């Protein structure tokens with residue numbers, strides 16, 4: 081039941097990464113967004129949280145954007161990847177998808193066909209939608225990217241009794257984190273500015289196109305800052 085020595089390393093090797101289309105961002109991420117982990121992009125208004133969630137669904141459809149050790153992750157495991165986008169804010173825009181696709185050399189329609197978008201209006205729908213993700217897989221959908229944009233808006237606006245909230249939001253995370261592990265996929269969640277989450281960034285604005293993404297929590301990477309801009313191409317630099 082316990083894994084030791086070489087097994088630990090082999091287990092860590094089944095972890096693949098998704099590129100953000102930003103050199104700096106990827107750099108700070110240790111190579112890219114990690115599968116089997118939950119990565120949070122908390123940030124200020126118009127900081128780009130949503131843009132990254134979009135760019136992420138797009139890059140998922142460009143095979144050269146999935147970095148993984150072939151000796152530990154067969155092409156068959158990352159074949160025909162599909163993303164699940166749980167939209168809590170109603171900020172999903174299929175046109176931003178088309179545009180990002182365009183500038184990346186991807187069939188925008190392919191992205192839309194391989195991305196499941198669930199509109200959630202309350203904390204119950206949110207949690208439930210994240211729970212059905214398994215069924216989706218069970219239906220033969222190779223879910224490899226999950227997006228909860230955002231993660232804490234519903235829970236906040238619904239809850240003194242702030243214990244029920246944490247107790248519930250924690251239950252959501254449990255499902256999310258487990259999801260990431262058993263199905264070897266990347267989990268992304270946003271937060272406008274208490275809960276688990278292996279990676280945590282805080283984004284902000286700079287000079288126009290400019291954005292400053294600060295990585296302040298991860299189990300094996302140092303705190304660092306990546307700089308990128310948002311343009312009609314999506315995330316870039």
Ligand SMILES: Nc1ncnc2c1ncn2[C@@H]1O[C@H](COP(=O)(O)OP(=O)(O)NP(=O)(O)O)[C@@H](O)[C@H]1O
Pocket residue numbers: 123124125126127128129130131132169171176179272310311312313
């Ligand atoms: N087509 C585009 N061309 C250039 N920039 C764009 C385009 N679309 C969006 N942007 C940029 O994206 C910024 C907002 O991105 P967004 O991902 O929605 O931030 P956000 O953190 O999710 N905002 P919020 O949910 O309110 O906290 C804008 O203010 C624009 O500068």
Ligand SMILES: [Mg+2]
Pocket residue numbers: 116117118257258260261
């Ligand atoms: Mg995990």
Ligand SMILES: [Mg+2]
Pocket residue numbers: 129130169171
């Ligand atoms: Mg947003």
